[PDB]
Amino acid sequence: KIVNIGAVLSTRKHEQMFREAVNQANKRHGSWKIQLNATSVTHKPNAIQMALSVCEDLISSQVYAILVSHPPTPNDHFTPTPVSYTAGFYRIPVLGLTTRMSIYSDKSIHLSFLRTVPPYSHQSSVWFEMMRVYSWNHIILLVSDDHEGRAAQKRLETLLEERESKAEKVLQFDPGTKNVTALLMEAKELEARVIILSASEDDAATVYRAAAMLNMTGSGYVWLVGEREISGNALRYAPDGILGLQLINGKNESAHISDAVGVVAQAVHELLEKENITDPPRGCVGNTNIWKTGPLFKRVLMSSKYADGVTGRVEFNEDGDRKFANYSIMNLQNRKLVQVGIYNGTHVIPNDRKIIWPGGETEKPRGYQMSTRLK
Amino acid sequence: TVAVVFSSSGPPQAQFRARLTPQSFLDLPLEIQPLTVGVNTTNPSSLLTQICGLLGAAHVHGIVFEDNVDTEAVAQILDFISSQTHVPILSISGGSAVVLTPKEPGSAFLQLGVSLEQQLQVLFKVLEEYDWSAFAVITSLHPGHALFLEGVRAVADASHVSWRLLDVVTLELGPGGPRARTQRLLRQLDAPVFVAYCSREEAEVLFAEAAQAGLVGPGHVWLVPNLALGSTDAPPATFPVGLISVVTESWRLSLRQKVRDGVAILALGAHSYWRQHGTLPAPAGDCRVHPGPVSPAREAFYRHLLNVTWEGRDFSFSPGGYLVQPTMVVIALNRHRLWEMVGRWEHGVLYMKYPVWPRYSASLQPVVDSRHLTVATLE
Numbered sequence: 001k002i003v004n005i006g007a008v009l010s011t012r013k014h015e016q017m018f019r020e021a022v023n024q025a026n027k028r029h030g031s032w033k034i035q036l037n038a039t040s041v042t043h044k045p046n047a048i049q050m051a052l053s054v055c056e057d058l059i060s061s062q063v064y065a066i067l068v069s070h071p072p073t074p075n076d077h078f079t080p081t082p083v084s085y086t087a088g089f090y091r092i093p094v095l096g097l098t099t100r101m102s103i104y105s106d107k108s109i110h111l112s113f114l115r116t117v118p119p120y121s122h123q124s125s126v127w128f129e130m131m132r133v134y135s136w137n138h139i140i141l142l143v144s145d146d147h148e149g150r151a152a153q154k155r156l157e158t159l160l161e162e163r164e165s166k167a168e169k170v171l172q173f174d175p176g177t178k179n180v181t182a183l184l185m186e187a188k189e190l191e192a193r194v195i196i197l198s199a200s201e202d203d204a205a206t207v208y209r210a211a212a213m214l215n216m217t218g219s220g221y222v223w224l225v226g227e228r229e230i231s232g233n234a235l236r237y238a239p240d241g242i243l244g245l246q247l248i249n250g251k252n253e254s255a256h257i258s259d260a261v262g263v264v265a266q267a268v269h270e271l272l273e274k275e276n277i278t279d280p281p282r283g284c285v286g287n288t289n290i291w292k293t294g295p296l297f298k299r300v301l302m303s304s305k306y307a308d309g310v311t312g313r314v315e316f317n318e319d320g321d322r323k324f325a326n327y328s329i330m331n332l333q334n335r336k337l338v339q340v341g342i343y344n345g346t347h348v349i350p351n352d353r354k355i356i357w358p359g360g361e362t363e364k365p366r367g368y369q370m371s372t373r374l375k
Numbered sequence: 376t377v378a379v380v381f382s383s384s385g386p387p388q389a390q391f392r393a394r395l396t397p398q399s400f401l402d403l404p405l406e407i408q409p410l411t412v413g414v415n416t417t418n419p420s421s422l423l424t425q426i427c428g429l430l431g432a433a434h435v436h437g438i439v440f441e442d443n444v445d446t447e448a449v450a451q452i453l454d455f456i457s458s459q460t461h462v463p464i465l466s467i468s469g470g471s472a473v474v475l476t477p478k479e480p481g482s483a484f485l486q487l488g489v490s491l492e493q494q495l496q497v498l499f500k501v502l503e504e505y506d507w508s509a510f511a512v513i514t515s516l517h518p519g520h521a522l523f524l525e526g527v528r529a530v531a532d533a534s535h536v537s538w539r540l541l542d543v544v545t546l547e548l549g550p551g552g553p554r555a556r557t558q559r560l561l562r563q564l565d566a567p568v569f570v571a572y573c574s575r576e577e578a579e580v581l582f583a584e585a586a587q588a589g590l591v592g593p594g595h596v597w598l599v600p601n602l603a604l605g606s607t608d609a610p611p612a613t614f615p616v617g618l619i620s621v622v623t624e625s626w627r628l629s630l631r632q633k634v635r636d637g638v639a640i641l642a643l644g645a646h647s648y649w650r651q652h653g654t655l656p657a658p659a660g661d662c663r664v665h666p667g668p669v670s671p672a673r674e675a676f677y678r679h680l681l682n683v684t685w686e687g688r689d690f691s692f693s694p695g696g697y698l699v700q701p702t703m704v705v706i707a708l709n710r711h712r713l714w715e716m717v718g719r720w721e722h723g724v725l726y727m728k729y730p731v732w733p734r735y736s737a738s739l740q741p742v743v744d745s746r747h748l749t750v751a752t753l754e
């Protein structure tokens with residue numbers, strides 16, 4: 001039988017990469033049982049036009065799965081949404097390979113959606129692990145007010161209360177907002193000397209500047225950030241020594257496609273060796289009923305282990321997100337990022353470098369100067 | 376101007392034709408003259424096609440929705456559209472009544488229903504007015520249960536009773552599953568009252584596994600939130616007698632009445648704008664052509680549209696777009712397999728109608744426990 005899968009991509013050269021990859025996947029384990037195919041589209045500015053183009057894509061093929069990417073990012077957020085609403089209506093399991101917003105994890109809204117890169121929320125595991133290794137125990141948190149920020153709060157809290165540490169003075173600030181020095185001053189009389197930022201590339205630029213007046217960037221203070229917190233219009237303004245971090249090979253946009261078709265195909269075979277798999281509905285217009293076996297196909301696709309992953313071992317969690325990824329720590333010396341370690345799945349392993357803390361010192365500055373004066 | 380969308384039916388077109396002429400139907404002070412649209416076969420194909428193409432033929436100012444129940448995916452689409460064209464919208468129906476928790480950052484969906492929390496906050500009153508005070512919770516693995524499960528443990532803490540909860544279950548109840556494993560977890564149970572949360576297609580699978588494990592007799596009583604129940608009127612088989620579920624106030628009404636209750640809101644909101652801000656806020660919404668960079672003025676009309684009282688009711692919404700403090704009712708399944716209003720919940724104090732829950736039996740003939748008596752005093 002002819003099994004058809006489609007995808008939405010950006011450049012039309014990655015489309016040819018995808019076709020070559022599905023071919024090499026055919027010649028890998030294929031046989032006379034069932035063959036595969038491919039179909040591709042490109043983005044458009046008005047998302048509504050994209051939803052209609054996706055119904056055209058869908059009427060043109062009894063699609064079994066979709067892939068989506070957002071290489072051009074005038075809106076890093078609203079690019080992969082319309083395909084998700086348009087396909088989830090029929091439980092058509094859509095894979096997303098490059099998008100990091102945290103809203104697409106709440107499964108009550110997007111009925112079916114998966115990923116091959118963990119989101120910004122899963123980031124705080126390495127923060128807590130660094131806290132355990134280096135023995136820091138009094139931390140100030142600093143988070144924005146939109147959902148993508150609010151997630152990290154709950155994450156860190158549930159991760160800390162398992163040991164009853166209860167970090168102190170979580171400060172919020174509205175997004176796109178200038179003049180945050182009204183806030184930092186409240187975090188000026190506090191005992192803890194290690195801040196943890198999580199914001200957008202437009203906001204982080206501000207607070208880096210707003211600190212330059214308060215002069216907390218000086219010696220003795222140490223702080224660490226997240227991926228989006230550097231590498232933007234903000235990195236020009238960063239104070240040196242901020243131990244931020246990054247992904248192993250994200251933004252590649254080509255290695256993933258070789259991974260997805262590998263975990264998609266290894267499932268379609270594991271599925272069709274079973275009961276009624278009838279068909280997905282051919283045509284947006286003229287039908288109002290869901291593919292009666294969508295959930296099964298997502299049920300199986302959840303636990304499909306994959307071995308030879310160009311990115312590495314790929315597997316999914318209970319919500320749907322690549323578990324056990326790689327993060328590569330950084331450190332900002334003389335306005336250039338230089339690696340200082342590697343975060344592998346569960347623990348951290350540094351090597352062959354001396355960390356440069358912000359003030360220029362060369363010894364691990366512990367926080368918590370116990371304030372002598374008293375109120 | 377106002378628009379109306381029919382998105383589901385058995386042919387009511389006599390009611391559709393009825394709404395064609397009445398450009399003078401309402402008494403609300405504005406140009407209520409409504410246009411109209413129709414929909415066959417609701418799906419993302421047509422539903423997108425129609426309702427911005429219409430936005431080109433007029434500038435209406437807003438839409439009003441209605442459809443049939445048991446379709447859930449159509450809830451997001453409407454939110455998606457209202458995110459681009461920047462036009463307020465209002466849903467009064469079954470399908471899109473269930474409340475979406477996070478709405479897009481700049482949308483104006485204005486749903487018409489109640490949350491999960493504001494239903495558990497009513498069950499946990501009835502549950503104690505007869506102080507059963509001991510229950511078990513059963514939930515399938517349906518999207519959004521982890522939200523619900525946090526409902527009970529939180530509410531059970533901001534109250535003043537022991538609330539001795541025995542246990543919690545979780546079990547796959549779709550069309551395909553091992554009934555024995557669920558039979559294992561079910562038959563191994565002992566509790567007076569059960570609070571269950573499942574979809575309707577889930578329900579008949581559950582309540583059928585009930586009888587064979589002996590969990591349906593007058594020795595038990597069930598509570599399920601607004602979701603599990605049927606359309607409203609024809610309850611299927613296998614729903615035990617003596618069900619309890621809370622339902623918003625418009626529970627029993629005519630579809631032609633709701634719409635008049637619908638357009639009233641936009642009307643009372645509009646006329647209230649002219650009195651304070653002045654002269655009919657700019658009504659306009661554009662489809663695909665260059666939509667919605669930012670909204671400096673319509674977003675100021677949004678706030679007027681929140682608080683709005685009419686005909687002696689309060690309809691004040693919360694930023695999450697679900698009603699705050701509506702006058703809810705309770706309903707139950709008597710021995711004629713209908714639904715009968717059992718008790719109103721008006722303005723913070725739960726009234727009732729039965730000073731003791733009549734507990735039925737296998738074949739009607741309502742059983743009264745012998746040891747219970749009625750005492751009559753005065754002051």
Ligand SMILES: *[C@@H]1O[C@H](CO)[C@@H](O[C@@H]2O[C@H](CO)[C@@H](O[C@@H]3O[C@H](CO)[C@@H](O)[C@H](O)[C@@H]3O)[C@H](O)[C@H]2NC(C)=O)[C@H](O)[C@H]1NC(C)=O
Nearest residue numbers: 001002003004005035036037038039040056057060061062
């Ligand atoms: C296997 O994959 C191929 C590749 O997509 C499938 O075929 C292609 O078939 C569609 C259906 O007719 C063609 O599309 C239509 O294309 C015209 C071209 O202008 C367009 O105007 C229409 O709006 C409509 O979309 C498409 O052109 C054609 N591919 C190419 C390169 O010409 C094929 O159906 C798949 N078969 C199986 C068994 O999987």
Ligand SMILES: *[C@@H]1O[C@H](CO)[C@@H](O[C@@H]2O[C@H](CO)[C@@H](O)[C@H](O)[C@H]2NC(C)=O)[C@H](O)[C@H]1NC(C)=O
Nearest residue numbers: 647648650651652676677678679680681682683
């Ligand atoms: C109900 O809504 C109205 C309208 O949003 C509120 O009145 C507004 O109050 C703000 C702040 O004072 C003013 O800038 C607006 O001009 C007012 N609008 C109107 C219609 O006068 C009102 O405060 C809300 N609360 C109540 C109880 O009515």
Ligand SMILES: *[C@@H]1O[C@H](CO)[C@@H](O)[C@H](O)[C@H]1NC(C)=O
Nearest residue numbers: 178179180181182183185213
């Ligand atoms: C706004 O910035 C100025 C800098 O000139 C500062 O003096 C002022 O305190 C800030 N506003 C608040 C509310 O702190």
Ligand SMILES: *[C@@H]1O[C@H](CO)[C@@H](O)[C@H](O)[C@H]1NC(C)=O
Nearest residue numbers: 188211212213214215216218
């Ligand atoms: C930095 O600290 C404060 C501003 O917070 C300022 O008064 C002080 O003079 C500055 N000191 C130096 C060495 O820049």
Ligand SMILES: *[C@@H]1O[C@H](CO)[C@@H](O)[C@H](O)[C@H]1NC(C)=O
Nearest residue numbers: 249252253254255256310311
């Ligand atoms: C992306 O990944 C592939 C395979 O891991 C690698 O060969 C390639 O150099 C990477 N970068 C680009 C730009 O393709």
Ligand SMILES: *[C@@H]1O[C@H](CO)[C@@H](O)[C@H](O)[C@H]1NC(C)=O
Nearest residue numbers: 248249311312325326344345
């Ligand atoms: C990624 O993680 C694996 C698992 O330990 C590790 O072997 C590898 O060196 C890491 N880095 C890569 C693949 O670039």
Ligand SMILES: *[C@@H]1O[C@H](CO)[C@@H](O)[C@H](O)[C@H]1NC(C)=O
Nearest residue numbers: 324343344345346347348349
């Ligand atoms: C990560 O590296 C450490 C180094 O000792 C090793 O013990 C551990 O097994 C590795 N775990 C992963 C994620 O492969």
